[model samples]
Target: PHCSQLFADLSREELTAVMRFLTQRLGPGLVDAAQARPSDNCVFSVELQLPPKAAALAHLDRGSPPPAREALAIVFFGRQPQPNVSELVVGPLPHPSYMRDVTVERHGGPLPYHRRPVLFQEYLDIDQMIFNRELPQASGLLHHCCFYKRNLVTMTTAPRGLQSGDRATWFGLYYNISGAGFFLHHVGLELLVNHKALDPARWTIQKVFYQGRYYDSLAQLEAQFEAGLVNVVLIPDNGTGGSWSLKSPVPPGPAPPLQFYPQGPRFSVQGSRVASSLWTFSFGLGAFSGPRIFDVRFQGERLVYEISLQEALAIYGGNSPAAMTTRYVDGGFGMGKYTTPLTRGVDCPYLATYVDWHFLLESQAPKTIRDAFCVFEQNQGLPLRRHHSDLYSHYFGGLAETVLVVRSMSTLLNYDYVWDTVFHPSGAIEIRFYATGYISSAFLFGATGKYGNQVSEHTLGTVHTHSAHFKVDLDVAGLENWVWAEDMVFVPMAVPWSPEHQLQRLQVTRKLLEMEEQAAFLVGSATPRYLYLASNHSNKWGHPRGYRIQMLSFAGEPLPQNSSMARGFSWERYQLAVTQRKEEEPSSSSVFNQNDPWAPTVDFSDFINNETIAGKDLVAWVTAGFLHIPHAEDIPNTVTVGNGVGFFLRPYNFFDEDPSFYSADSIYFRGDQDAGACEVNPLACLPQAAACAPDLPAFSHGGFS
Candidate 1:
């Protein structure tokens, strides 16, 4: 179950061994989190314990003994007198001999039980109580205006309540459409269930919201309806053409252009590692944090220690209680767990190499998500560079742009995130995520337009902002790095060529951020155009070897600091920040924040408390996102076009010349040379070499699960 390779994700056997060992040490009282209740003690999740950079590098580069393989298990100790969550480290995998409690050491205290992630069983329990017990109280109102019954589904929202330690959740009801997302169909009914008690029997409904009115109880709403004192809006429970379904009503049309390699693929995928002529890296899906890459190397030299997704957040605003208060921290819901299998042709290229993912979460046995990742070399249909000389020398030189892409898709409830780790032949890396799925909507009422647009007859597609945080550990040349801020400014000065005239000359401004505060850039604020992390080591050109971080985002306004939940995802306050690396500050945000955000488990703001960062191991935290004001076009689903947000890691003076200059794909020829000869230009032989088309595979998908 475990691989000999060090950087690979934990295997099924490794997870099982850790689970069994944990059970034996914790006693038989430990229950599987899949079926555990609030009063039960259970192991919530188990994932690979990422080895520290120092230890990992020591072994990987210096030929030292490899660090002990380990697994991190989060346990919910609900039965104890002071219920709390524990983070335990199980080491020497496949046959663990020791377990260490790192809860207090890592979190500074025991994690509050109320902050623990809600299990699948807990959602089911809440659903049963709402459908079987609570909804019956308003049967008269439901059948009259909404035609509602057992055909409705529940969507839960958080930071639960107004303050910390409150476990009340707002559950929104929607019409369950077959073979389509129900997010577009809202019935305007929401129930606040306070399930904080240890016993399910002690749970109670805290409030009820319908249309725009708030009622004390569902039964009271029913009573008011019976007395003819309630205003009701009748909504047709019908599906219009192409509104709720993905299936097309029209006949099939001609297909779009398909990509095929003239020769076989140039890249290879073995286990979790991907390698090509120029690049090598290991990739994995973090059970909570999503996709990550490790030990990234270019030309056998390490460029980055790690680049990983830290968290995905979506904050919504609407007229309804559930919509207005909804802020989703998808890490709490498990991005890897919700990873939908990619379709052969639509989600990815038909010939792309698909890989599976294994994990143990909220269950006794490990599960596999087939086609969880797709790796392919995509021809960008453009030129990396091209130059034609006519005056001095008649010659032409160019290279087609091709990128190696590792992709994974995560379907977090109503939205899909396409995570792409793109590698260019020029030694640049691009990290991007495209949002394309159903937008959450609320029932339309008076003044609802202020919150969002009406996507349907009575459905208001609520406005929201989607943001993701990334952890970039770029080791440009070595572990020690410095942050440099560079921007161009216009300065008024006397012209050297003509001293009598004044000129505004453009100049470069360079500054070294010796401290963390100097490197933290606030969201919606101006940033240095050329920001990069560089090493003291110089390249052949005598310039510091460095990698520039170019951000691409249309980020919306961040949540005000005064908000109670702002501290939970405080990383959103900054567009970018560089800090001293520490094993103690591993992640920017925590899974526990979604439940009780007032007292966040990991406040990212604390990580940037004016620490010294000059010539030291550093990490850059990046936030990228956009504001979504859904409209009529969002009825079917949001399109990925103009919805992508991320950043690029480009080599800046890291090499003496452009890295792609010597690529095999490069094409160069002079007018005096034989352009038709294959030896001079590979493009001349494309017709003969790529005569045959790619053998296509049968269309397949494994997403129904």
Candidate 2:
């Protein structure tokens, strides 16, 4: 039954016809070999070694190894010049539907100059498997990032020298988030152009103080615990001249002065009435210059000594006031001890050492006065315990008086030098303190460590082995001016009983001293009259609450001495006086209220806007304010609406988003306005009717369906 269903063999004539047709279509000379070789060349070959089934059946019956069966055979054609053309001819041979008819729509019209390539009657089958499927989806998404491009333009094409004084403008854009809470993550993006060919060093970073370490990357900087704030600074890399155009959310402002108390003496050409007597003694002793010098009893001591400036100069062999002090080889009054001359320079203007003991008459008591010294045993015979006892015993009881000379050029300069001498019953020790210059304008005062002799005392201690205590009384007349000078005083416990006992006590004090002289030459005239107790606890660390900062004001009534809660602590303004009597009404200005109207209102924004202030100065002021905030528990953590919450969200969302539309039929649609006309009279306009209607004939026919 299967054999009967097989196809009949083709006649020789029909087979020959097919071979002839194929030979003509894919003939050797049909295409340009060189041009078609890439895609149309022959890519397959084969060989036939078997015959048809009928032939094999006849050979098998003979019982010989039976000739190989002749099955359906195929012969591979030679390489063709155009495989595409051959594939086209063979593809449509059995499918008449693939044949396309050609017709001319405009046979009589003239054609364009260039002839179009002729299209073939048949098309080759292209594998649909090789086509891309996701290309359409990739084209529908939006891009969110942006970029900037720059170019340079000049007026002339030819090379020419630029005018000597010509100028060029440069612009920069700054993008950053706003508000205080975002301070820690405030990112800045800047685009700047430097056309002057200026040195890179001249360009400085304007905001936040960078220590040249740690700030190398934003990641490292963000790791710091301190709050971050935006700062805009313009640093001129060229020392001479340059300008920049900066765009920032907040404009820059002026820098405020860093106020500090005056150290040493307040000097002037016209000395103070209280200090005039000392000034005259110093001038008479050749401590000052010029013909106005006079003589006086150096001090109120019983010894009367008279010496003219000229005479003192003759003895010293030099007119330099500093050198003249050398003439007093024997402590001025024939005392056996040798004295050291004062050093005269801008930095070191005081005569201080560990020797002389003469006391200056102008030195004020408990203020504007101090004694610095290193104690050593009389003969190194006393043990450590005895030595400490002797020092403490002498300190609490107050020892003999010592002298110090204060010098200054003009008080307007605000620079003063102090020469301190401590006169112990045993002998005297002189110490010279130098100014750290305007860099750190303050005075170090007060004592820390053990007091009252409760701890074990030592005797005959080595100079290096003993722990020394220093005390200074600063003269703070106008405390308001040196507001920044206020700080915490750390007094280390006298002796360390154990690791736990090695802590320092904090004492906050303000100076109150009235100026007796009105001389324009006096430096303290412009400075606040306040004595601040300052000391360097560089070697000591860790306190009950760590280190702290305190501020004082002369306008406020004096704070209770040694009271931690006195006047409830204020930084703005202070009350100067108050009335205790019920009938005696308190003066509005004298009321010591934290909420007093007269209290100074600090507006940091104003100072930040000044053009003269640099980025570093701004950072330092911020640091000071940061230090002013009381330790964690002393102040409550509060948050406000609007500004507070807004600041917190700015870093991640700096801008508002654009509104979006939902559907084509919504009010936002472009055709929404035309809907009324269409509904009022179904397709009133012909154009609308035509656009909305379907073609009846085309839809009704099978072709349309």
Candidate 3:
């Protein structure tokens, strides 16, 4: 039952039946596979669900196996453009009639699509209702949006039940055809479009904002345009037309055509599954959230069962209606969808390898991403550790560490995020994210130093937070690993050997993050806390065996508890959140949260209902990233120089000593010995390449699963 290195996508039968079932529900004309885009509205979750980790582990550990089951997560954006989520779990894969035993669950619903096209179809009417003409930006340049807000009416006070309500939605407007684009939205000439009813007969225009001034309705703005009123001006185009976008181009510098791995890649890979003398394998292609890795081992021992991403959030704030209304939960369009193909030699190292995957639509061949996932090795050039003492007569030259990186990049409108999971030879797993793209800029409303900084003449660098919520399923040794908190606080109490009141000592106060209620905690910067996903089992030294998870970058969620803009994005409220692992609670954010304010598809709040989680399978939702208050240098594109967020997981007591102690990369020398007489390690030479020619790098493309 050990999976022979195979991952899955919907097969022909599965895709056809699933689509047939979906269209049967939504009706014929509305849904189809061949034609679909972001705004076109279609249900798509580009991932293949693996069997429950426990089930797979049990089958591989013992002989019992569960019947194959695959769940396809989808977003149904029918006539009402709501992200109506539905999951279809099919059994007896490749069945003649795949639909016979399929089970579908409608996640969170009765949620209306505030973005109904009737709004767009009747937009001219809404404009005519006010301006008696049209809104400023042309049809192509103008993009309409719904401003999300929670209803103030208390449901418990008067209603029998709040199933569905015929409430009016407030929409917003923006023009991108001018000089600016997505990154220039903060200065986006803020305009809020409102109508009483969504239907054709009742929809009507409300109010507007263009730059610094606000007009009550489009009619008044129309009156202004007609009378040549003062202070009314169309925003200037902010584009910097050039072949290559360089704010101020700098000449390239070189130190003699150096490469990280001159011998190509210093790693090994095997196939029919695969092989690595880095001797490891990783996990999945997250439907929306990048890759969700799993079952990682080193030197024939299981070190980690699974580690993956659950969600990420871009929570923004500003004076503009769009920025103020923005609280992005990437549970939808962002994740598996926005992932663009990796440009070989650019996205990943030129010598790097890849995995191709697809979103099969049964009727079609397969909607594929050619080089969707990338795996490679990087020599970081820095030593893990080294020590020398002339008097003590001992020296260690040090071991240069190499990382087996599994990665993919997502360019969302203006930001490009490198989602990476790095495996080290020292039993450490580091997940890092680097942002190197243009900042989402706000239009300067003639004022500065208040909401943002003037990164440019008229561009306000709006302050915003990019929090990557990583849902790590750590199986330290096994599925029963415990999530524990160990705080190394300083105490004045003396050790027995030092005598009472004579000397002070440090102590580790440890406790189980036993329940979900207590698991939500802010990790302090210093002398405050250390987190562990450890096996209850102890090593020979009687030390609990586990891996320590630490945030290596800015990991704080700095929004006010009661701030209006930070409402449904509650996961950002904590630096770390853990719960008993369950397949049902896979992600923290949901796309439906955009319009369905009251009921986000996977409301993070609903997942933390206080389930007992001690000494059980644990899922740690750790958020680590930096806030972007755009600086002048963040002009052309944000650089990864000082703009990277990373966290590491290293073996705690999995072994008695540092596992790297056995590393051939290490070398020792005695000061008394001459340079010619210094001892050398074979790992530094011989055993490094067991086979003269390993076929890993020889592989052209296609990969298993």
Clash counts per candidate, in order, are 0, 55, 13
* Pairs of residues clashing in candidate 1: none
Order the candidates by lDDT, highest first.
1, 3, 2
Error of 3 at 203 (Å): 6.7
Model 3, 557: alpha-carbon shift in Å?
4.3
Candidate with top lDDT is 1
lDDT of 3 by residue, 219-300 (tens): 5655654555525334443345321244445665773332344334556544213346645654556655556765667777
lDDT of 1: 0.90
TM-scores for all candidates?
A: 0.98, 0.13, 0.79
Residue 90 error for model 3, in Å?
3.8
Task: Tell me the deviation in Å of residue 373 in model 1.
Answer: 0.7
Candidate 2, residues 1-705, lDDT tens digits: the string is 000101111223323333334335444532222222222322111111122333332443334344331111111222423212111212111111221111111112221111110111000010010012111111111011111121111110000012221111111111112221111111111111112212222322222111112232222233331233322222211111001111344665884322111222222222211122222222211111100111111222100111111100001111111111111101111110111222222212212111111221111111111111111112122221211123323311111122223222110011111222211111111222221111101011113211111111110100000000111111111101111222356787755557555677778744322121110111112332221211211212321110111112112122232532222222111111111111111011110111111121111112222232111101111010000111111111111111100000000010122111121111211222343465532323435434432211111111100
Using TM-score, rank the candidates from best to worst.
1, 3, 2
Q: Who is ahead in lDDT, 1 or 3? A: 1
For this target, which candidate reaches the highest TM-score against the unseen true structure?
A: 1
The better candidate by TM-score, 1 or 3, is: 1
**Which of candidates 2 and 3 reaches a greater TM-score?**
3
Q: Cα miss at 499, model 2 (Å)?
A: 83
Q: 264-346, model 1: which lDDT tens digit per residue?
A: 78889989899999999999988899999999999888899999999999999999899899999889887887888999878
